[PDB]
């Protein structure tokens, strides 16, 4: 679980949430409000 995934030569390690809708997710987890990184099952 140490390995993970989320422009040309862009890099950004930000924790800012994937909103799945226009919700007040406010950077906090919930239904339609998900953390930007996912782990590779290697």
């Amino acid at each position: 679980y140490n390995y993970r995934y989320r422009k040309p030569f862009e890099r950004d390690i930000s924790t800012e949430i994937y909103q799945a809708g226009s919700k007040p997710c406010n950077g906090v987890e919930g239904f339609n409000c998900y953390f930007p990184l996912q782990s590779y099952g290697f």
């Binding site: 422009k7 040309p8 030569f9 862009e10 950004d12």
Partner: protein
Amino acid sequence: CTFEYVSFKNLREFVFKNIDGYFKIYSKHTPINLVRDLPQGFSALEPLVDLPIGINITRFQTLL
């Protein structure tokens, strides 16, 4: 924090621009007669540096 480096009469001039994580710097220096505002004439700035840092810039400030 992934990178670090070390190298009124003086009109000192610079240009700064950034492209796909590269960051380019050019300059010129001259003594002048009038100090108040940009004196009429012509000269070209010449390159100094390019840094491959990757940052996504939108703002800046002078360090007085």
